Amino acid sequence: SPEEIGLLYQEKQAILEAIREGIVAINQEGTITMVNQTALKLLGYDNERNVLGTPILQLIPHSRLPEVIRTGQAEYDDEMVLGGETVIANRIPIKNKQGRVIGAVSTFRN
Amino acid sequence: SPEEIGLLYQEKQAILEAIREGIVAINQEGTITMVNQTALKLLGYDNERNVLGTPILQLIPHSRLPEVIRTGQAEYDDEMVLGGETVIANRIPIKNKQGRVIGAVSTFRN
Burial (CB < 10 A; 0-12, 13-18, 19+), residue A19, is buried
Which of A6, A17, A92 is nearest residue B96 as measured by Cβ atoms? A6
Q: What residue ranges in chain A does DSSP mark as E strands?
A: 22-27, 32-35, 75-82, 85-95, 101-108
Q: Give A64's DSSP letter.
A: S
Do B91 and B26 form a contact (C-beta atoms < 8 A)?
no
Q: What is the CA radius of gyration of chain A?
A: 14
Give the separation between CA A29 and CA B58, rounded to whole angstroms. 45
Q: Position A33: which residue type?
A: T
Q: Position B7: which residue type?
A: L
Give the separation between CA A11 and CA B44, rounded to whole angstroms. 24
Residues of A in contact with B19 (CB under 8 A): 19, 21, 23, 90, 107, 109
Measured in angstroms, the resolution is: 1.8
Interchain pair A8, B8: CB under 8 A: yes
Question: Which experiment gave this structure?
Answer: X-ray
Instruction: Tell whether B25 is within 8 A of chain A (Cβ).
Output: yes
What is residue A106's three-state secondary structure?
strand
Interchain pair B8, A11: CB under 8 A: no
